[PDB]
Subunit: 193 residues, 3 copies
């Protein structure tokens, strides 16, 4: 029928990163941020931090539906991420402009009934080093839902409790252990396996 993914869009000749609408297997439309530039492109970005203008210390309902701005920082929403999911790439930039990434061969979040349980594939490569497998098979947790954190390190993650905290505070935190240091830029993105 029409574009299912950012990869479809890239194959149809959309070469600039930006917000495009795609159709989920639901057939429900959704405008997403396509990264057409990184690692071959065709990535759908579901998380972005870039300047600390958006509060990421949010409750369950807010993470469920998504929040933020197409103009800047956002979380796409756990329902959308579930519908969406296919491999994972996390991109990270520090304040010295150093680039660091990690790539997982598969990435899926379950539905709300399974509390958006993270089921993550094998680490593939990445100067950032593996820091999410250790959170595999864990529900998602927000300040208004325990799960052995969210309040301790101020954020929301598949928390006993973490080795990455990308929805943490913009401290200039947004931590990746293998990578006390909060990154300038963080992006989480997906692409058909």
């Amino acid at each position: 029928t029409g574009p299912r993914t950012c990869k479809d869009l890239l194959d149809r000749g959309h070469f600039l990163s930006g917000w495009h609408t795609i159709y989920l297997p639901d057939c429900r439309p959704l405008t997403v941020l396509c990264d057409m530039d990184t690692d071959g492109g065709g990535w759908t970005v579901f998380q972005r931090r870039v300047d600390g203008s958006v509060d990421f210390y949010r409750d369950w309902a807010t993470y469920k539906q998504g929040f933020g701005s197409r103009l800047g920082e956002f979380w796409l929403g756990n329902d959308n991420i579930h519908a969406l999911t296919s491999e994972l790439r996390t991109d990270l930039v520090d304040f010295e402009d150093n680039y660091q990434f990690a790539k997982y061969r598969s990435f899926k979040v379950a539905d709300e009934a399974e509390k958006y349980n993270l089921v993550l594939g094998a680490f593939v490569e990445g100067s950032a080093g593996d820091s999410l497998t250790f959170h595999n098979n864990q529900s998602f947790s927000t300040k208004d839902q325990d799960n052995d954190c969210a309040v301790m390190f101020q954020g929301a993650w598949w928390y006993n409790c973490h080795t990455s905290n990308l929805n943490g505070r913009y401290l200039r935190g947004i931590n990746w252990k293998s990578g006390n240091y909060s990154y300038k830029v963080s992006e989480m993105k997906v692409r058909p396996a």
Copy 2:
């Protein structure tokens, strides 16, 4: 056919499950499409943003015709246009919100119960309801029932030219206690009250990093 099925406000859009802030098209009461910036994130969301300053990349020291039609960029700073702002507030009760950020990352705000600008014939007269609350303090009530003025069309209550003296465009009285369309002066300035100023907020000598004005139906 799209007018009758399309959304009429950002609140409608939020109601249809649009949770990310961004530019969407809505249909004015006369059925004309208008691409607006929806703030879905702040104070429950569903706000239509008609003003935004963020980096000083756009000149806001503009004439009447330019303020009338709107100017700026969807990528950054803009004024939606006085005709559009009138169309959006002409019928019913839109509350107004003002969000301000300083260069030390202090977020401040002001909220009013209703906000309407009249049409061009009435020179976009401001009809402002009650100040509800806001950490930024009230700096708009002073401007109720004032015409809008630009450097080239002085409709203020000052014997001189407010828009020229304070280098902006606004519902100036004699002259102002707020000046959000003022120069992008970046924090403190020696020049007097000619920046993005909110008197009850950071005063007449400090120009905000971020300014946003937005409406939502009551």
Copy 3:
């Protein structure tokens, strides 16, 4: 749709804010482009934008051909698109430049056309009309586009490599707007976002934009 064919059409239809809109190319191919509705009367289609150095412009032929970058920031629209945009009739060109002290310079030319890929996206430029940046494009008239992997210049070496850009290089250049984002004055010779008649071979601008409008 038979609708808007240019950013100027959009402006006439009452689109007053700069931003990305879709237009219909001469062949009815739809294209989403950045419209500058603010500058010099507005109605400009922007095909090049530098603003913060977040995008690598040191790219190969295929990449310049199809376009690259981001609607959120820096981009090159793509040589095929630029050709499609400028084949029929008269597009005038405006080049807008902003230094790190926020001073604006510009250059305006009466006509601007790039040929198709067979003709190596040749520069066909009209008379300089005015501009505070001076004229650093006319030197480049009637010259094939070159990238690091496709050397069509008049130098015995590879201009694109020597000045880390992609341009209508001769021997080698007087402007280099797709050069490295070097942030102001730089010791290194002429490998930044340079406009000789502007801030010279040793100053790289903060902002650069190249745009077209029906004359």
